[PDB]
Amino acid sequence: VDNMTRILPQQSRYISFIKDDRFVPVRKFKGNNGVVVLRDREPKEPVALIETVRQMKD
Amino acid sequence: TGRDDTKETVYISSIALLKMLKHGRAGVPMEVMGLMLGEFVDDYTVNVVDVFAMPQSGTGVSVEAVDDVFQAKMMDMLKQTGRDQMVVGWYHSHPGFGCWLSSVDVNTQKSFEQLNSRAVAVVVDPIQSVKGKVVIDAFRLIDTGALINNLEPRQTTSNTGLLNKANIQALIHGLNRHYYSLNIDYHKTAKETKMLMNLHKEQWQSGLKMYDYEEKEESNLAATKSMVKIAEQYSKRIEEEKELTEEELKTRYVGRQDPKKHLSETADETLENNIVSVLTAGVNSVAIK
Amino acid sequence: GRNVTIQLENADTGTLDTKSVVGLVMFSQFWYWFPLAHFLSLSFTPTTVIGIRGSDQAIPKFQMNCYAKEDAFSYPRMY
């Protein structure tokens, strides 16, 4: 399942970001839909981003 | 451009209804008429305060029979008592016909629109006032112009949509091609409600008044005898009536006009009464002496 | 667009969403006044996990594990 995609409340239980990946939550997963701040292991190597759209239109 | 134009709920006072029924009932079957006096507030709240009747004309409802000499002079008697308020429409009674507006009635209503364009035409049907029903309906002209350009939806905006659709054919055709029919609600104060509600001086005294005793004797005898005759039917019924196919069981053993139930209702009504009967006699004796 | 649900309540604490109460009492009265329909909007909440990289404040692309039968929650048809 991709990041920033429709997640019904039922599939939200099972959601578990790969531990081996760079992105590991700073605390135990919130487990409920919402902004969950993630720690990125490496800023050197590329992190492809989705820049927020409001700033372009503004 | 203008108002919402939702047809008014005609809020009919307790007095105006009481007079209207009385007025029509006296005149039946000869058509009766009068003007409605009221006051116009909100967008759709017309409070019909009171009505008075105009002297029966041999032309029935007519523009001719709206007699300005009578009308004016009446305004003036009511003026001195300070009960005068603007004319907000007119009512008349057709008993001969259902509730709708005849071609003659449409002209009559057209004159009223000049006073107030939210004026109502109220049809009272006093022949069917003999039922528990009060058969009354209220109408307000629609312009032909509205229907030709198909602009009619304006008038039926933002509403619960409950419309009376009783009475069709010619009547309904006329209604759709001339007026708009909308609900009537009855608003009354609790002061008014209580006065009416109150009954006799002897009403709160009646429980020590009691039936003549020759009739209690008669009644006791009648009930014992009657149940016996229905009990025959009931014994016959449960001889059999344990097969199959529901409706057939009811025809075979006379399970239609069902004996068990009709017996259970009579037995209990008489039983409750007989408790009341004794209760009064003992109390009367002891309280007084 | 098939991404919103009506929540009864905040799902974190287990205790009422202020907005959501106002929406539904306002929605339920529309017979009296039809324009108030719109108030069901305050009850509408988007449901979606949005992961936010705390070292840039932007949305990282990455993939998460969901142990579930994948076909059983397939996206809706187009009617």
Swiss-Prot record, chain A:
N-acetylated by NAT1. Present with 4750 molecules/cell in log phase SD medium. Acts as a regulatory subunit of the 26S proteasome which is involved in the ATP-dependent degradation of ubiquitinated proteins. Interacts with UBR1. Belongs to the proteasome subunit S1 family. This is 26S proteasome regulatory subunit RPN2. It comes from Saccharomyces cerevisiae (strain ATCC 204508 / S288c) (Baker's yeast).
Curated annotation (Swiss-Prot), chain B:
Keywords: Acetylation, Hydrolase, Metal-binding, Metalloprotease, Protease, Proteasome, Thiol protease, Ubl conjugation pathway, Zinc. Zn(2+) binds at residues 92, 94, 105. InterPro entries: JAMM/MPN+_dom (IPR000555), JAMM_MPN+_peptidase_M67A (IPR050242), MPN (IPR037518), RPN11_C (IPR056263). GO terms for biological process: mitochondrial fission; peroxisome fission; proteasome assembly; proteasome storage granule assembly; proteasome-mediated ubiquitin-dependent protein catabolic process; protein deubiquitination. One of its GO terms (molecular function) is metal-dependent deubiquitinase activity. It catalyses: Thiol-dependent hydrolysis of ester, thioester, amide, peptide and isopeptide bonds formed by the C-terminal Gly of ubiquitin (a 76-residue protein attached to proteins as an intracellular targeting signal). Belongs to the peptidase M67A family. Its EC number is 3.4.19.12. The JAMM motif is required for the deubiquitination and degradation of ubiquitinated substrates. This is Ubiquitin carboxyl-terminal hydrolase RPN11. GO terms for cellular component: cytosol; mitochondrion; nucleus; proteasome complex; proteasome regulatory particle, lid subcomplex; proteasome storage granule. The keyword Transmembrane does not apply. SMART domains: JAB_MPN. The gene is RPN11. Component of the lid subcomplex of the 19S proteasome regulatory particle complex (also named PA700 complex). The 26S proteasome consists of a 20S proteasome core and two 19S regulatory subunits. Interacts directly with RPN8 and STS1. Residues 10-145 form the MPN domain. Present with 16400 molecules/cell in log phase SD medium. N-acetylated by NAT3. PROSITE patterns: MPN. It is an enzyme of class 3 (hydrolase). It comes from Saccharomyces cerevisiae (strain ATCC 204508 / S288c).
